[PDB]
Amino acid sequence: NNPLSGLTHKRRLSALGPGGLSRERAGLEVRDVHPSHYGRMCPIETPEGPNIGLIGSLSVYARVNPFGFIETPYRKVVDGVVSDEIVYLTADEEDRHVVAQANSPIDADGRFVEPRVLVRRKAGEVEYVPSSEVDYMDVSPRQMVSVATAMIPFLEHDDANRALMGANMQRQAVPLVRSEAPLVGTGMELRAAIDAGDVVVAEESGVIEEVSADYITVMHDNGTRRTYRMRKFARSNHGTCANQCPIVDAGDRVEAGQVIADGPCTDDGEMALGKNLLVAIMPWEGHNYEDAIILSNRLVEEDVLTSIHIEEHEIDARDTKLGAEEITRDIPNISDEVLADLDERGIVRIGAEVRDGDILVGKVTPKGETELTPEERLLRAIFGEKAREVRDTSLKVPHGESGKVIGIRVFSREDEDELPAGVNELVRVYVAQKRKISDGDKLAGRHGNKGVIGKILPVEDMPFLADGTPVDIILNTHGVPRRMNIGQILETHLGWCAHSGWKVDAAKGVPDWAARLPDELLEAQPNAIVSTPVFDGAQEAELQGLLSCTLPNRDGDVLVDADGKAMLFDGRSGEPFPYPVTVGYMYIMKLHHLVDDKIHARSTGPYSMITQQPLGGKAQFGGQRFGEMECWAMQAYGAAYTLQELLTIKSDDTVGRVKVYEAIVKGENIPEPGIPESFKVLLKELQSLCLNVEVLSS
């Protein structure tokens, strides 16, 4: 569903399977984080369900030794001098040596200013050790981290739990239609996007001969050329688009190893899983109460948050003792306004909109013969209708989806393809729709702040700054301090600084906070891009200094003051809010938990073979399960009749089912529940298990 999910599906470590241990077999000792995991396996990226601690992901710098042992590199230090020699050590090898801090006060010669430096010893103990005693030091920060969890800015400020959660939702982002690069990110994004494989990389340098939406032909330096066939609207394994747009020009020379066309969640060759949105951390009339979020309808209008969803439907035309199944239009008893968008070959015309219940592929099948009702025999003489000896086993578009039609991939034995035995024709139709943002869709940042969309309210009804720019998103303040995810407001401040730009006035000497701050950072342009490594990043003082210099956009207006808050006017009442509220830009991504795929309702569907209970799941008609714990609450209220109906006539009793249906079509009073059939089936199993079981009237 995004390049990140593909990346983390590989380079991940599981504990289940043949020869491994199951969830019930897994004790509390396995799920922990052993101190030996440092640098080998990341202690963040982990599923949060029942598989917590079993399935993990490899670190960014880790390597597999030839024997199967996980091996990591580390710098070696001698007499307070760190060489550039990079050695690779296994887990047990680190016991004999002493590894040092990833971020240590190096003096450009290897010596550390103070002797005692925080180092990790053999048995996982972290103690101070004189500089002359340590022999190894870490390659770099973010060595004990994974690729997915290396994209979270201000990681060191977030709690382990929220960082874990955010790393988890990183894999669940969906590809938008624009995929804007984040304003604030980490340097890992570019490498991850390049190595994901779905961003085409010019293998050999040279100038570009010609560029087009469907193909690109690069003119190499030596005679021959190379053409890169592009993939457009390719269906993914999770029903997400895989658009691939080129980002080169007609005659600009390219270099081997350069990005050529962006992937589903990439722009300019770096990761882009979401968008940059204005943020208000204030509570708003309880529509954002308890982790809810309210978005602006501008995102609906501007298509800021919208994702294409490609759906594939299959139909099999096999061989049967009825003869064969023909893909034609001769479907019995059909109208015209439903058949208008279906071609004369038995399929939909390319580019015809359909919704639930519409006919998709006409697979006529010989009906056979059963008890033809006498009423049918009478009926055929009133309108002249023919027998229609074939059952209309066509394709009905299931409930809760619609959209346009992409294309037809038709296979047939007449086409001389390797179809399965007995199968004569295989037709796969593709349906796509543009899913707008709506209430119930799950949104989340990169710090683990989740939540559904409480309300999509118009642009007038939002706080707006003195510039008149409406806010984009609103988050609840209660969720920040109670969840230890303070990093999100830091990211918000940095995002606002990047959006506005700054010019540190280093005229009368460099400011003290900016002294350690590197060059080319004291000056910045509006809507610039900055990066922040997870553990070696911008400090608090640097952020304060950036907030101090916040040059305005077009007029003279410093909307965000030094402390970080800003003044907002209510869009409903119009009076200014009595206190300033912090504003900024935070990265927000759509999650693959849309409300459309999670809405389900059932009046009367199918039932299982053994017991007459309904089925389960959205694939069939489903029907909610009423577990025995809910029955306990049923009993606690004492609502005996409701429980009786639920367990007898809404679930089990066949005669009760048909009778109650007849009752609420005839407007008649609902009759008494009968004897459940599942109880009789249990009775029969007991009777057939050589247990004499008999129910006694008196």
């Binding site: 270099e255 190893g257 770096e270 701050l517």
Partner: peptide
């Protein structure tokens, strides 16, 4: 950067990585 098509991402890094990932 060190990547031909890399957009300029100014970073607050304080130290240089001895090796790339």
């Amino acid at each position: 950067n060190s990547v031909p098509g890399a957009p300029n991402r100014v970073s607050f890094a304080k130290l240089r990585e001895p090796l790339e990932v």
